[PDB]
């Protein structure tokens, strides 16, 4: 603090409407985690799946587009 | 996070090139069958 500039620095806070900030902060635990999870599922549903799936069978078409039959 | 979008438009560009590739194939195996059925049909007609 100084006649003409204030600034405090904190390595963590917010505002203290109580005494403790667990109970608020859980909530934001609660979300990073929900997010993790949703966003590994969907990665994971998304490309490990569907590309194998995709790429699963090729070539038995590929090596008959001669044929006469 | 900025690299995924380039993997995901470079898969999406192969598997345009595929899907053209294959539909070309589909188109000519297509046409060897109806060819080779009518020839069949033709061949069983003229027997009898």
């Not at chain 1, 997010?35 to 995709?54: I, M, P, V």
């Amino acid at each position: 603090v100084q006649p003409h500039v204030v600034t405090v620095l904190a390595d963590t806070a917010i505002r203290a409407d109580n005494l403790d900030e667990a109970a608020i902060l859980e909530a934001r635990k609660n979300a990073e985690q929900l997010l993790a999870n949703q966003k590994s599922d969907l990665d994971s549903a998304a490309a490990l799946a569907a590309l194998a799936e995709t790429a699963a069978q090729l070539e038995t078409i590929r090596k008959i587009k001669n044929r006469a039959q | 996070q900025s690299a995924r979008m380039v993997a995901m438009k470079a898969a999406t560009d192969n598997a345009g090139q595929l899907i053209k590739d294959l539909q070309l194939i589909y188109n000519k195996l297509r046409q060897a069958a109806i060819t080779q059925e009518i020839s069949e049909i033709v061949g069983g007609a003229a027997a009898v």
